Amino acid sequence: AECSVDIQGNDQMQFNTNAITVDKSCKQFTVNLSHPGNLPKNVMGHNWVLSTAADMQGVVTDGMASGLDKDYLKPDDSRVIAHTKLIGSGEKDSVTFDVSKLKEGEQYMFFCTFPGHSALMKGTLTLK
Amino acid sequence: AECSVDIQGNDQMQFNTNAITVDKSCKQFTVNLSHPGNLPKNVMGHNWVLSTAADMQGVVTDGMASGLDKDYLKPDDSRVIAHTKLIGSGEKDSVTFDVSKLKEGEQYMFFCTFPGHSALMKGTLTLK
Ligand SMILES: [Cu+2]
Ligand SMILES: [Cu+2]
Ligand SMILES: [Cu+2]
Ligand SMILES: [Cu+2]
Numbered sequence: 473a474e475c476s477v478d479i480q481g482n483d484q485m486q487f488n489t490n491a492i493t494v495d496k497s498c499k500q501f502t503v504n505l506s507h508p509g510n511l512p513k514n515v516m517g518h519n520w521v522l523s524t525a526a527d528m529q530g531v532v533t534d535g536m537a538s539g540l541d542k543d544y545l546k547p548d549d550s551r552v553i554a555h556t557k558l559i560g561s562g563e564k565d566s567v568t569f570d571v572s573k574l575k576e577g578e579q580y581m582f583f584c585t586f587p588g589h590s591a592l593m594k595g596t597l598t599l600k
Numbered sequence: 601a602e603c604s605v606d607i608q609g610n611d612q613m614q615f616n617t618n619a620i621t622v623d624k625s626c627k628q629f630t631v632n633l634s635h636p637g638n639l640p641k642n643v644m645g646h647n648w649v650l651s652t653a654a655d656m657q658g659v660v661t662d663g664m665a666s667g668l669d670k671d672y673l674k675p676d677d678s679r680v681i682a683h684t685k686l687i688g689s690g691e692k693d694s695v696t697f698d699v700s701k702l703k704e705g706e707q708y709m710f711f712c713t714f715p716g717h718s719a720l721m722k723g724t725l726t727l728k
Pocket of ligand 4: 613714717
């Protein structure tokens with residue numbers, strides 16, 4: 473299956489998907505984020521962030537406290553495996569990461585860290 | 601010859617090379633950019649961008665006008681064949697692209713689109 477996935481974060485606080493699967497044979501994997509709608513990022517900014525399932529909460533709460541100027545992400549957060557930047561409607565961003573960062577059996581989660589968004593905009597990433 | 605090259609963009613506005621040659625037999629090619637020095641990206645950020653020689657100017661000027669928040673690159677610029685992100689000193693990024701995107705005889709150029717950098721930080725990429 474393709475070594476990349478196109479994700480949309482819309483004005484209704486939704487990702488167009490809640491489960492991503494990464495093909496074990498890909499040397500790399502790329503996420504392409506877009507923002508259909510009209511709301512600017514200071515009001516409806518969306519990012520795509522990846523961590524183990526266990527680290528999600530801490531990344532989300534430290535991220536909230538970091539501010540908009542930081543893309544609601546804690547600088548040098550060691551729990552973040554890969555991330556795009558905070559995007560506003562009509563904008564785009566992509567992130568590529570080595571498939572060797574993921575492990576079999578481990579449970580990953582992708583999510584948005586804009587305040588209050590993680591509750592709806594979140595999902596699983598599994599290596600298969 | 602190797603299917604990858606390590607490039608350095610330093611605080612003096614220089615690439616450690618002005619000519620790259622891509623081995624026709626490689627299925628893919630990877631550029632590894634680094635930034636020796638101390639200047640942050642908002643002051644001395646460097647990226648590695650590839651286009652035909654004819655498209656370089658337009659990519660550079662539209663890039664400038666896009667801003668720092670966009671890595672001084674026009675969103676969805678169709679003229680861009682491959683690119684890394686804008687990097688600051690002590691940082692790193694890599695880009696891999698299919699060697700099949702390049703054509704024999706065509707003339708490519710790699711360059712930095714941080715304002716005013718393309719004048720010094722530029723070079724040729726040829727498929728051989
Ligand atoms: Cu596949
Ligand atoms: Cu969001
Ligand atoms: Cu070779
Ligand atoms: Cu530069």
